XYZ file of C-alpha atoms in Angstrom:
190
model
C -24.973 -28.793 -4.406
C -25.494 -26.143 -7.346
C -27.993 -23.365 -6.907
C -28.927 -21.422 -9.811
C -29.836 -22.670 -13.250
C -29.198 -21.729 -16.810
C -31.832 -19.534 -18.681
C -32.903 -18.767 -15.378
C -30.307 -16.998 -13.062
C -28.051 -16.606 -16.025
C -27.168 -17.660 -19.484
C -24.386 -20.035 -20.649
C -23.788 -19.687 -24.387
C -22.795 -22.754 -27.019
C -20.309 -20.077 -29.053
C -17.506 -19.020 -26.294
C -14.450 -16.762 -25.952
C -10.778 -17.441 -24.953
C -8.100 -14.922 -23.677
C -4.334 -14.157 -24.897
C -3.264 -16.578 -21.324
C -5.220 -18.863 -19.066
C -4.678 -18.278 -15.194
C -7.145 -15.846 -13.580
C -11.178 -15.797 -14.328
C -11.777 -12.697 -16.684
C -14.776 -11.130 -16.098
C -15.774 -8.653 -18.645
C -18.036 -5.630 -17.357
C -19.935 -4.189 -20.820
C -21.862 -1.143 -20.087
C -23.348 2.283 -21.793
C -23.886 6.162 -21.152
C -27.804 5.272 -20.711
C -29.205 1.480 -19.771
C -30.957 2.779 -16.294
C -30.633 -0.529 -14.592
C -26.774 -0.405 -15.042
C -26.470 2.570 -13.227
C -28.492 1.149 -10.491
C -25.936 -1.816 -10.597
C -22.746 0.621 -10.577
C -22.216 1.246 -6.646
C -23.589 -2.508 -6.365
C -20.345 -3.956 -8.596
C -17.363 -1.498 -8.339
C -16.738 -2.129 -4.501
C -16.837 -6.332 -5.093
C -14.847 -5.659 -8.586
C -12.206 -3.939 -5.802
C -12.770 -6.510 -3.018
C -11.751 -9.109 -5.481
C -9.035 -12.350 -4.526
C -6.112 -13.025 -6.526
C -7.831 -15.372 -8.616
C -10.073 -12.704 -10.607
C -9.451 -10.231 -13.622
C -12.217 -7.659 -13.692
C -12.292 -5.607 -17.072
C -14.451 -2.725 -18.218
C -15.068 -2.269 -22.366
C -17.278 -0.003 -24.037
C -20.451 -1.737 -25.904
C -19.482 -0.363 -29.110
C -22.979 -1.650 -31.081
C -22.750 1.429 -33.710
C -23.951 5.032 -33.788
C -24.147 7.015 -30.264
C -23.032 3.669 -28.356
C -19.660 3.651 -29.697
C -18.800 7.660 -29.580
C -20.018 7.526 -25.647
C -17.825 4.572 -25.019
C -14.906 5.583 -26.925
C -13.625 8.238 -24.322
C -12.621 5.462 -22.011
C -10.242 3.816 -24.292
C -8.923 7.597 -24.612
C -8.764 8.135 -21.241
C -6.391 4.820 -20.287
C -4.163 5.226 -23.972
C -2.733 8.666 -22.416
C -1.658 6.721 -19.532
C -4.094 7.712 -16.200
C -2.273 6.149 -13.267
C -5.720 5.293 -12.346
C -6.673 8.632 -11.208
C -10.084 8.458 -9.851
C -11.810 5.551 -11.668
C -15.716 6.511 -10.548
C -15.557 9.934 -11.463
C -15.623 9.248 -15.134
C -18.905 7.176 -14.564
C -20.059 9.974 -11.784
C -19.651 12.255 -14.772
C -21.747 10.573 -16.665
C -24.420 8.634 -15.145
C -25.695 10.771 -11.671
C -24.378 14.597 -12.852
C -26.253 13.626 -16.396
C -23.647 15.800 -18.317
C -23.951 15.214 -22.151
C -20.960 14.097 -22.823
C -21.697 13.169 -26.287
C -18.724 15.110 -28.939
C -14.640 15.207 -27.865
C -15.026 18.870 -27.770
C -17.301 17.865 -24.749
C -15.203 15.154 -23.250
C -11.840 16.870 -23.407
C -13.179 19.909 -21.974
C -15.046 17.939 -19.076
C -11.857 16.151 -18.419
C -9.244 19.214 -18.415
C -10.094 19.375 -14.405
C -9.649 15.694 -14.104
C -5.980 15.478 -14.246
C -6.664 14.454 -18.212
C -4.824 16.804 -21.093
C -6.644 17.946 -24.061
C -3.347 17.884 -26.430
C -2.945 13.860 -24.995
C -6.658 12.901 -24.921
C -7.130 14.733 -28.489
C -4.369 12.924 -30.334
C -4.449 9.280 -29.448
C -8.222 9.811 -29.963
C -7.680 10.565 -33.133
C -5.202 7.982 -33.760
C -4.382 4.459 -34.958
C -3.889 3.456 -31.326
C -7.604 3.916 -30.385
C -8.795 2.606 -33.866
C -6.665 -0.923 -32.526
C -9.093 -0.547 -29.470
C -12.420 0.145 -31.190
C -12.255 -3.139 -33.572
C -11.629 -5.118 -30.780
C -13.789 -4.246 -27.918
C -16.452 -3.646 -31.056
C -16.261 -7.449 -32.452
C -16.106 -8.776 -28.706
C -19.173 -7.516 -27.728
C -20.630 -9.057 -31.053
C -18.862 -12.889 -30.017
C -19.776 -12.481 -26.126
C -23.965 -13.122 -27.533
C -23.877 -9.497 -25.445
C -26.580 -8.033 -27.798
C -27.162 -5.002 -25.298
C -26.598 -3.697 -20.957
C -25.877 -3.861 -18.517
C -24.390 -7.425 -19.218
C -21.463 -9.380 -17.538
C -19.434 -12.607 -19.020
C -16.877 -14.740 -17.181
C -14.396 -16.463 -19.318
C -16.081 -15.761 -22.227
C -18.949 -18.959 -21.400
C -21.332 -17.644 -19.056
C -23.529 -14.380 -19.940
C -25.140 -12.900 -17.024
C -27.341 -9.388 -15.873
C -29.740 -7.810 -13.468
C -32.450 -9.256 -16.257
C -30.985 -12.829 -15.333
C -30.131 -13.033 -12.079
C -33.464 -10.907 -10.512
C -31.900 -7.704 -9.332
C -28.390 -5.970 -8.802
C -28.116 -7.531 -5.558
C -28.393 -10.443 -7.308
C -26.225 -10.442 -10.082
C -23.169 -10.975 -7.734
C -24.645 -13.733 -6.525
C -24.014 -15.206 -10.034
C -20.749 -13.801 -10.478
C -18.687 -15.597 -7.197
C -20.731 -19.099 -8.297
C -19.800 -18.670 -12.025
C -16.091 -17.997 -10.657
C -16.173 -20.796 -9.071
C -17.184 -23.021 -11.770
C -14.683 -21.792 -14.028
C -12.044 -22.034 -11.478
C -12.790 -25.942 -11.277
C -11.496 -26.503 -14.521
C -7.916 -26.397 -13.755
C -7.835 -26.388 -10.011
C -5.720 -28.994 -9.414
């Protein structure tokens, strides 16, 4: 059959990624406090990320690229480490993105967060700890090996790179994601 093409709806990429285990599809969500179209995407991609079968591992990293990219994105890392059993997941994101709130310094974050069932003494110190610094490195050099450059952007299993910008619209950009699934999925479907 096969209805999309590379460069075109999306963008397969000759230097991939692997995970710690093979089993489920990852599919890594990179995003930013600004990129407009991402926003516009948001509302679009958490409801199928939810609606999801057993077959697919959604994950959201910050695109730590240096300067104010990295201090925006390092909150969320924060905000899991303390241990949030998933409290409200959009209205971090619907903090940031529709209310417009700064959100740029800890002092900011924390303070913002002390009505969201977060703790200041909890977010503060594994913020400013080793544990977080583990986090950073990672998520920073992953970006850097998934050919992300900038967002919104989306990878499955570390091969295929694909956006708004590639597949036409946000609308769109699912219609990539379930195909590229897929196509992973072949490889070790009996």
């Amino acid at each position: 059959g096969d209805d999309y093409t590379a460069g075109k709806e999306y963008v397969e990429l000759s230097s991939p990624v692997p995970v710690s285990q093979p089993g489920k599809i990852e599919v890594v969500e990179l995003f930013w406090y600004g990129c407009p179209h991402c926003y516009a995407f948001e509302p679009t991609i958490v409801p199928w990320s939810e609606k999801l079968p057993a077959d697919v591992h959604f994950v959201r990293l910050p695109a730590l690229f240096g300067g104010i990219w990295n201090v925006h994105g390092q909150m969320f890392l924060t905000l899991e480490s303390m241990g949030v059993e998933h409290d409200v997941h959009n209205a971090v994101f619907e903090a940031i993105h529709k209310e417009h709130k700064k959100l740029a310094t800890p002092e900011e974050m924390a303070d913002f967060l002390a009505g969201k069932g977060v703790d200041k003494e909890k977010f503060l110190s594994t913020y400013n700890s080793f544990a977080i610094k583990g986090q950073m490195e990672k998520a920073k050099k992953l970006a850097m090996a998934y050919q992300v450059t900038g967002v919104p952007t989306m990878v499955v299993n570390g091969k295929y790179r694909f956006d708004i910008g590639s597949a036409g619209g946000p609308e769109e950009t699912l219609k990539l994601a379930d195909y590229l699934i897929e196509k992973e999925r072949a490889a070790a479907k009996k």
